[PDB]
Design a protein around this ligand. Structure first.
Ligand SMILES: OC[C@H]1O[C@H](O)[C@@H](O)[C@@H](O)[C@@H]1O
Ligand SMILES: OC[C@H]1O[C@H](O)[C@@H](O)[C@@H](O)[C@@H]1O
Ligand SMILES: OC[C@H]1O[C@H](O)[C@@H](O)[C@@H](O)[C@@H]1O
Length: 362
């Protein structure tokens, strides 16, 4: 059988061999900065679930350089405060995991600065609540910036000294999210909200169902469960996960493999290429919480088998190896976007997603 710890570490090595820039303490400067945050999350999570510390020095290097004032958003004053609330949220959650890994309060402090910064763009005066994604524009309240925020405040309610302010925020933010209409009639989440021209009212914009918008929300509800021990949060999460797993909604193929809506047309762009592994990692958080919350030994079995089915398909059909040479002895695995379709080329977002799936299985 497959060793998910072995393959996660081979995929991180492939990630580093092809995409890490030592001079920049970052992966692929030609790819979006927020996806370096996701990749960092994936490496941190590998180390947490497996018990290894073989990438801790590198992670520390990336954090030290990427927490500097960003050259494209100096008014954020660094600490990952960026020109979009979702970019900030990806790094904030990575600093929550770093804290979980190390116990070092410095990482939790960054997460707390990031929550206060994102909150600046929460308004109650449009859509009854939620935050904007686009800090310079203030035109779009979307699913992912609001899921990241919700998962951040819920995480802080379990970890921060002023825990009860964060719990109140997370409970409010979840009430808002649920009432927004982004969760649609099959319990899947569309891309965001549109605003009515004459009336100011907000409604589900019916833009695509992206896998990472079915995933970050599960981590948030898991943290809400841990903050309250109220199983209602796990029941909502399981309804959203069960909808992804259902072939009738088209995110799961007849072969059982998680499939981005853009794959069929070979049109997944640099953002969409990372989406699936973010879902996988969050589905593993939900599986762990469900199985822990009950005495049934089959509890969470369906999520565990789903992740395992996907891992076997991705390893068998989507994987490629770096050619070792007489000089560069580096060894790792490389991955394309489709967890079932063929390997044609690796990119850093595709690779980060692949590590996510393996770490979900550790
Ligand atoms: O948004 C501004 C933009 O400028 C930088 O050069 C990049 O690294 C991006 O990922 C970032 O988002
Ligand atoms: O709600 C519709 C929404 O769709 C786009 O993808 C966004 O970039 C926004 O410009 C707009 O508000
Ligand atoms: O690629 C889809 C992705 O594009 C942009 O980053 C935003 O409109 C997000 O709301 C959306 O999920």
């Amino acid at each position: 059988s497959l060793n998910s710890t072995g393959l996660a570490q081979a995929a991180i090595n492939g990630l580093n061999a092809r995409f890490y820039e030592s001079s920049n303490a970052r992966w692929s400067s030609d790819e979006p900065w927020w996806i370096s945050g996701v990749a960092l999350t994936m490496v941190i999570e590998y180390m947490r679930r497996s018990g290894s510390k073989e990438y801790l020095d590198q992670v520390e290097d990336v954090i030290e350089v990427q927490r500097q004032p960003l050259s494209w958003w100096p008014s954020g004053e660094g600490e990952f405060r960026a020109d979009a609330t979702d970019d900030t949220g990806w790094w904030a959650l990575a600093m929550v995991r770093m804290y979980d890994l190390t116990g070092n309060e410095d990482y939790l402090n960054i997460s707390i600065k990031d929550e206060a910064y994102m909150r600046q763009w929460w308004t109650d005066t449009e859509c009854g609540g939620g935050l904007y994604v686009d800090i310079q524009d203030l035109t779009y309240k979307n699913a992912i910036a609001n899921e990241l925020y919700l998962k951040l405040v819920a995480s802080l309610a379990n970890r921060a000294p002023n825990a009860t302010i964060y719990l109140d925020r997370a409970q409010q933010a979840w009430t808002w999210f649920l009432g927004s209409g982004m969760i649609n009639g099959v319990n899947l989440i569309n891309d965001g909200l549109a605003r009515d021209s004459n009336t100011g009212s907000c409604y589900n914009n019916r833009l695509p169902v992206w896998t990472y918008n079915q995933g970050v929300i599960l981590g948030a509800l898991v943290e809400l469960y841990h903050a309250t021990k109220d199983e209602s949060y796990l029941l909502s999460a399981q309804a959203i996960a069960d909808a992804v797993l259902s072939p009738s909604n088209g995110l799961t193929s007849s072969s059982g493999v998680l499939t981005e809506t853009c794959e069929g047309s070979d049109s997944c762009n640099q953002d969409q290429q990372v989406f699936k592994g973010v879902f996988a990692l969050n589905l593993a958080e939900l599986g762990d919480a469900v199985a822990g919350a009950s005495s049934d030994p089959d509890a969470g079995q369906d999520y565990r088998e789903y992740l395992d089915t996907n891992m076997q398909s991705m390893y068998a059909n989507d994987r490629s190896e770096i050619v070792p040479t007489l000089f560069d002895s580096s060894t790792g695995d490389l991955y394309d976007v489709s967890w079932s379709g063929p390997f044609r080329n690796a990119t850093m977002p595709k690779q980060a997603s692949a590590i996510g799936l393996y770490v979900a299985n550790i």
